[PDB]
Design a protein around this ligand. Sequence first.
Ligand SMILES: O=c1[nH]cnc2c(O)c(F)c(-c3ccc(F)cc3)c(-c3ccc(F)cc3)c12
Ligand SMILES: Nc1ncnc2c1ncn2[C@@H]1O[C@H](CSCC[C@H](N)C(=O)O)[C@@H](O)[C@H]1O
Ligand SMILES: [Cl-]
Ligand SMILES: [Mg+2]
Length: 213
Amino acid sequence: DTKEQRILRYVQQNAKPGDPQSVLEAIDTYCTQKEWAMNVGDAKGQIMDAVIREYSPSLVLELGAYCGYSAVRMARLLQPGARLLTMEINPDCAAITQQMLNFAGLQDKVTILNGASQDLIPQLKKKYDVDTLDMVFLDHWKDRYLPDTLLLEKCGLLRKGTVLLADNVIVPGTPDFLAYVRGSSSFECTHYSSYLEYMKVVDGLEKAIYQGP
Ligand SMILES: O=c1[nH]cnc2c(O)c(F)c(-c3ccc(F)cc3)c(-c3ccc(F)cc3)c12
Ligand SMILES: Nc1ncnc2c1ncn2[C@@H]1O[C@H](CSCC[C@H](N)C(=O)O)[C@@H](O)[C@H]1O
Ligand SMILES: [Cl-]
Ligand SMILES: [Mg+2]
């Protein structure tokens, strides 16, 4: 078995079915006490919660699902009828994420998309019937942040006020993406300093609000 499978089994044996908060707490306990993993975590997760509550997005896109931690965290705060789409390139992670969402009782709010973000984004309008996105959580791989942001704009998926929220802009760091959004009149940017999940290491989130072409 894999670390990801151990995390899922730990949730299934130590959380309450249908209780998202208990799922998050179980994941955080396992990753603090047993094995580190790249979930956004509780310190940065609290900032994400604040953002979700401020904007009450109807349609969120997540880039990078992993075990489903961040998907659980966002989906538990969505209003009735609101939806999350999450893209995940690794099929074993996609299956763990689906099972995690099912355990948490959130499966009707989330759709997992299999594949690479750069291949799936251009399909959102026609295949997946998306008009524009209200929020995007970028948390896949540092070198894809800038290219996928530019792709989302090209594809007409951003509207005035779409919120981009990017993890790990300090560790490992995303200097091309930060330089671009902070220098572009098409974004209004705020930095939220925090900590790397489960570690006493500084990290941060960037919020970049799209302002149109
Ligand atoms: O790749 C990631 N995607 C999403 N979120 C991540 C995340 O939240 C992380 F904290 C890390 C991280 C940071 C520091 C570290 F030491 C190990 C891993 C990674 C990551 C970075 C570099 C890699 F070589 C492998 C994984 C990711
Ligand atoms: N181009 C790409 N498209 C889609 N998923 C990708 C990708 N490159 C990397 N990934 C995926 O991005 C994930 C990064 S970790 C995601 C953590 C998650 N957001 C959480 O906080 O719980 C991995 O599962 C990895 O397989
Ligand atoms: Cl944490
Ligand atoms: Mg991350």
